[PDB]
A paper describes a structure:
For the FIP200–TNIP1_pS123 complex, in an asymmetric unit, four FIP200 claw molecules assembled into two dimers, with each molecule binding to one TNIP1_pS123 peptide. The homodimerization of the FIP200 claw dimer primarily relies on the interaction between the N-terminal loop of one FIP200 claw domain and the corresponding loop of the other claw monomer. A portion of the TNIP1_pS123 peptide was observed, forming a short β-strand packing with β4 of the claw domain. Further structural analysis of the FIP200–TNIP1_pS123 complex revealed extensive polar interactions (charge–charge interactions and hydrogen bonding) and hydrophobic interactions. The FIP200 claw domain utilized its positively charged residues, R1573 and K1569 in the loop connecting β4 and β5, to specifically recognize the negatively charged N-terminal of TNIP1_pS123 peptide. Specifically, the ε-NH3+ group of K1569 side chain established specific charge–charge interactions to the phosphate group of TNIP1 pS123. R1573 formed specific charge–charge and hydrogen bonding interactions with the side chain of TNIP1 E104. Additionally, the side chains of F125 and V128, located within the conserved LC3 interaction region motif of TNIP1_pS123 peptide, inserted into two hydrophobic pockets of FIP200 claw domain. Moreover, the ε-NH3+ group of K1568 side chain formed a hydrogen bond with the carbonyl group of TNIP1 S122 main chain. As anticipated, the ITC results demonstrated that point mutations in crucial interface residues, including K1569A, R1573E, Y1564A, F1574A, and F1582A of FIP200, significantly abolished the specific interaction between the FIP200 claw domain and TNIP1_pS123 peptide.
Author numbering:
A (entry chain B): 103 to 109
B (entry chain A): 1494 to 1542, 1551 to 1594
């Protein structure tokens, strides 16, 4: 996703 | 049997509300951390992208960070938050 990434 | 209000783990019963600030379902919590309901969970809870709150059971959580200022959660660029998958307590949808 371009909105968020897994930390 | 009782509603979790922080330190969410899988198996927890949680209260989920349609948040006005974010226009999104979030878990009710006393924690300073944001817990969003994962979009894939909406049909399991009989919600739609408009019920005001529902009880759910935590199946999964994922810690995330916003990479765009304009995102589905309406959080600022760089905000961290959990995304929580949930199901109904006792109905198979
Ligand atoms: Mg989502």
């Amino acid at each position: 996703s371009s909105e968020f990434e897994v930390v | 049997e009782k509603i979790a209000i922080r330190d969410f783990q899988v198996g927890d019963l949680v209260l989920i509300i349609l948040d006005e600030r974010h226009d999104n379902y979030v878990l009710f919590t006393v924690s300073p951390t944001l817990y969003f309901l994962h979009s894939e969970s909406l049909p399991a809870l009989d919600l739609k992208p408009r019920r005001p709150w529902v009880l759910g059971k935590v199946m999964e959580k994922e810690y995330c960070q916003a990479k765009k200022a304009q995102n589905r959660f309406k959080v600022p660029l760089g905000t961290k938050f959990y995304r929580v998958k949930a199901v109904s307590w006792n109905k198979k949808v």
